[PDB]
């Protein structure tokens, strides 16, 4: 895992340096067991960029989804929510840990990911799941339509990211 850590460290270094130099980059999909420092590294990237006057946003997906599911009106969340899809640099922290809610998955997340895919907006992820596992998590049921929707999501995630494993 020192090797894992080294690989991810130079990935993050390269990505921050490129972003700061105004280059096109692809985000990281960081995955692995609990507590290996995935969220920490996403935070380190955000703070590194901040140090260079580059903006970025980190969504904590469980609470994002909980807020959307529960409903909201006019506060900080609504104001921030309206910026997320077109944020210059976006990170989805702990995808896989949220409650799966089809309308949120398909009306908010899917379109968001499609947008960032086609406009090549850097998008990062952390998860306890690899892409295959995440695709299965995203399907609320065995139903065909669910399988198709989940597949759409995961292909967009794959187009947007390069996967890195951080070991126990």
């Amino acid at each position: 895992s020192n090797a894992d850590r080294l690989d991810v460290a130079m990935a993050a270094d390269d990505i921050c340096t490129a972003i700061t130099n105004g280059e096109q980059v692809k985000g990281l999909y960081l995955y692995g067991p609990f507590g290996t420092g995935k969220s920490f590294i996403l935070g380190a990237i955000a703070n590194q960029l901040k140090s260079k006057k580059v903006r970025s946003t980190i969504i904590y997906l469980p609470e994002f989804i909980r807020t959307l599911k529960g409903g909201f009106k006019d506060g900080s969340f609504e104001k921030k929510l309206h910026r997320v899809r077109e944020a210059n640099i976006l990170m989805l922290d702990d995808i896989g840990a949220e409650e799966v809610t089809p309308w949120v998955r398909d009306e908010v997340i899917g379109p968001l990911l499609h947008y960032r895919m086609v406009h090549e907006l850097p998008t990062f992820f952390s998860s306890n799941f690899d892409y295959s596992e995440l695709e299965h998590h995203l399907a609320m049921t065995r139903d065909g339509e669910e399988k198709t929707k989940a597949a759409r999501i995961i292909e967009r995630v794959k187009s947007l990211s390069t996967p890195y494993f951080l070991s126990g």
């Binding site: 969504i59 299965h136 998590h137």
Partner: protein, 56 residues
């Protein structure tokens, strides 16, 4: 119908998570109850502490 099923539904209920995520927690604990409980509380704390969106 057995302790494992119970533990899984308990995690799904209290963390409000998917079956697969709950099973990931269980697998990670590898049969150690205290380890699973500690992990549960770590994630419970994160869930109730973190804002949905943080802008940098």
């Amino acid at each position: 119908s057995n302790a494992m099923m119970v533990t899984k539904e308990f995690l799904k209920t209290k963390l409000e998570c998917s079956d697969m995520y709950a099973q990931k927690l269980i697998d990670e604990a590898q049969g150690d109850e205290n380890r699973l409980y500690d992990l549960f509380i770590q994630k419970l704390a994160e869930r109730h502490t973190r804002p949905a969106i943080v802008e940098y």
